[PDB]
Amino acid sequence: RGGRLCYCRRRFCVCV
């Protein structure tokens, strides 16, 4: 429920 994941683009990632 809600949201929780880390996106990875190029050579850097980010959470929420």
UniProtKB/Swiss-Prot annotation:
It comes from the Eukaryota. Disulfide bonds join 6-15, 8-13. It comes from Sus scrofa (Pig). The chain holds residues 131 to 146 of 147 of the full protein. This is Protegrin-2. It is found in: Secreted. Belongs to the cathelicidin family. The modification Valine amide is found at residue 16. Microbicidal activity. Active against E.coli, Listeria monocytogenes and C.albicans, in vitro.
